[PDB]
Amino acid sequence: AKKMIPIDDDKLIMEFKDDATAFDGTKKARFKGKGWLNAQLSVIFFKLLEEHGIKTHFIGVAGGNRLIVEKLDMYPLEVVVRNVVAGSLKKRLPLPEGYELPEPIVELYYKNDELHDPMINYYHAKVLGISLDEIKKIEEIALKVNEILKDYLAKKGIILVDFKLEFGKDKNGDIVLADEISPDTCRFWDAKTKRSLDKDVFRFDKGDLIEAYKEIYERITGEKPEF
Amino acid sequence: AKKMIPIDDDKLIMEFKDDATAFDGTKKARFKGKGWLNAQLSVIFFKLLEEHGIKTHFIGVAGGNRLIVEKLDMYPLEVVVRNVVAGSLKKRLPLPEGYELPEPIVELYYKNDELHDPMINYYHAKVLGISLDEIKKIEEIALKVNEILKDYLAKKGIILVDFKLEFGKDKNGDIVLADEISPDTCRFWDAKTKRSLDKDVFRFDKGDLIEAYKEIYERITGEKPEF
Ligand SMILES: Nc1nc2c(ncn2[C@@H]2O[C@H](COP(=O)(O)O)[C@@H](O)[C@H]2O)c(=O)[nH]1
Ligand SMILES: Nc1nc2c(ncn2[C@@H]2O[C@H](COP(=O)(O)O)[C@@H](O)[C@H]2O)c(=O)[nH]1
């Protein structure tokens, strides 16, 4: 759904594709316009976060589905922040889908396809070569990002249910937000109806993906999607 | 605007009045229904906060403009939390009115009429007999309260611009949220128009106070004010 194209030692192109994949590629489909929507939503979110002084890999746009991003020494992590009980959290806590958490939960996953992205804790993270100090910074950033996105979206009648972030290290040694921020990598629910406006629509055939993703875009920008 | 009536060693009545005062009582007016609205908005806010496990002095209602509250050993503080630049903050930061702060600011004021509520820091607070540990707890509670109120109001198209909290100590030695939480003690702006829906309307004759306060009530409860 994304292709990384190197430019040089300090930057690269992140290209967003219309291809969608779930359940280890056993489920595949192409959604005309998905790439554009995810790229554009990523821009909006990265820029919103940067306004608050969050460091992100975003540099500029290089076309509708193409972002220029700074090259990083990437942490082998998926960092997940959860506000509302959904998906895999139902397997860890005796709480129903939709349950509003008293505080946001941060989970750490070892980014590794062969092991199917297993959950880790701070000890495992050290073995993987990530210091406790780094993990503390990463979680602090993640929670700050969580609050900005959650509040921004809440004003637009969208629940930030949960989402995945990735991080890397820049030349200075600063920790920098990377990958993407889109309905591919977040759970968004309509505040009134609780319907999914994200990749779960595709994962579980709950409706029309392109329609859900256009909805998010329209609510954020006020504009019907261009392309 | 409030009268404290002692009952006994552990509780008292906080009575909300229709009288309004600004600029050290040099500016005065009576707004029919103001007391009821502030009393009722206080109930709503205290209960909302208690649902999140914030300890407050609120015990019960004893009439439209009367609350039963627990007797506390009061800290001589006004604790102000600020999300958006307004009022006196324009005298401290080179930032325009309406500027959205990256993070909430907590200011401490020594509650003292003669000295006109001067700003203090942690060192002054110690001389006034408040330990650094207490101040830390107070500020932690204040920021938690800020987040709950801000998010709750934002969903209703109301910007929590800033607000004043007061705190006391109960029998157990726990730190308890006290005084009131109303358009008298908060800055609320309409999200779309940025107009004041609070005591600033009276302070600076920017419109109809009772109209602004009813607006807050209506938006929160969905009901036009009873009395
Ligand atoms: N696109 C994508 N999103 C993920 C991945 N892992 C977790 N997430 C996101 O993180 C959240 C939690 O996922 P869960 O662990 O409940 O399946 C969801 O918003 C989900 O979309 C992944 O490998 N790819
Ligand atoms: N009613 C009232 N509100 C106050 C007082 N002190 C601070 N506040 C509130 O706290 C915020 C900050 O006030 P400022 O420092 O800008 O005068 C405003 O919302 C203001 O109404 C006070 O003594 N009385």
Curated annotation (Swiss-Prot), chains A, B:
EC number, as in UniProt: 6.3.2.6
PROSITE patterns: SAICAR_SYNTHETASE_1 (PS01057), SAICAR_SYNTHETASE_2 (PS01058)
Catalysed reactions, semicolon-separated: 5-amino-1-(5-phospho-D-ribosyl)imidazole-4-carboxylate + L-aspartate + ATP = (2S)-2-[5-amino-1-(5-phospho-beta-D-ribosyl)imidazole-4-carboxamido]succinate + ADP + phosphate + 2 H(+)
Keywords: ATP-binding, Ligase, Nucleotide-binding, Purine biosynthesis
Disulphide bond pairs: none
GO annotation, biological process: 'de novo' IMP biosynthetic process; cobalamin biosynthetic process
Gene Ontology MF terms in the entry: ATP binding; phosphoribosylaminoimidazolesuccinocarboxamide synthase activity
Gene3D superfamilies the UniProt entry points to: ATP-grasp fold, B domain, Phosphorylase Kinase, domain 1
Xref: CDD domains: SAICAR_synt_PurC
Pathway note: Purine metabolism; IMP biosynthesis via de novo pathway; 5-amino-1-(5-phospho-D-ribosyl)imidazole-4-carboxamide from 5-amino-1-(5-phospho-D-ribosyl)imidazole-4-carboxylate: step 1/2
Family under the similarity heading: Belongs to the SAICAR synthetase family.
Name of the protein in question: Phosphoribosylaminoimidazole-succinocarboxamide synthase
Taxonomic path: Archaea, Methanobacteriati, Methanobacteriota, Thermococci, Thermococcales
